Structures are given as C-alpha cells and as structure tokens.
Amino acid sequence: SMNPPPPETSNPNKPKRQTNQLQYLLRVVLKTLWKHQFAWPFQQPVDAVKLNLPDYYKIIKTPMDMGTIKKRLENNYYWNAQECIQDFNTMFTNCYIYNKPGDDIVLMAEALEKLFLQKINELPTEE
C-alpha cells in the first residue's frame, strides 16, 4: 500500500498573520526539538512504504510530524498557536497509539514531549 499524501502545508484561502506566539513556536519550540538527538524519527512523515509498515496508516488516520509542522509555520499556515500545539500533540499521540512501552521510539517520543511541554509552558503573552 501507498503512503497517503502528506498533510497540507499551505492553503491559499486561509488568512495569514505573524504573532509573537507563532514566532516562539517556530524559533524556540520547534527549533529546540528539531535539533534534539531524538528528533530524526519525527522530522518527516512516516514512510510506510520504505519502512514496510503497511499497518501504520490503517491505525494512524491523523498523521503528523515536525517536518509538516515546520513547513506549516514557515508558510504561515497557522493563525492560532493552539493549531500548532494541537499538531505537536497529534504527533506524540500517534507514536503512543502505534507503539508499545519499552519501544525505543516511545522513549524518544517521551523525551521530546517532556521538552515540548517545558518549552510551551513558557509560551509568550497573547496580543
């Protein structure tokens, strides 16, 4: 089976804005996780074809990854910070749905999620 198309990262019909919270999410939150030693399984959509995981997209119907989130921020796809935070949470939830305690990928996701929650707990004041 094929991979699904990756999540949209631009929508020509959606209004666009820059905010301090969106700057923080891209330049502080995403950057911190992107550079982390455990970022690499989360920097792009799960390629279930190259990895031969034909049940991945039978189980995961809302895929999300930091490469998509990065592009969404870079393309001003998000209007509200909460849209972006939701995507990070979907990414982690998917990992815990598909995988089991003790899996390496779960240890990696838990570490990244701890760092994510630390950085979003310092999200700047809304305008």
Ligand SMILES: CCN(CC)S(=O)(=O)c1ccc(OC)c(NC(=O)c2[nH]c(C)c3c2CCCCC3=O)c1
């Ligand atoms: C395709 C080649 N590369 C990718 C550019 S790769 O970086 O060489 C590479 C190599 C092996 C790999 O896994 C064994 C992964 N896997 C992953 O990225 C990955 N990410 C997640 C979130 C998951 C997985 C698969 C394990 C369980 C399902 C899951 O939850 C990558």
Ligand SMILES: [Ca+2]
């Ligand atoms: Ca699980």
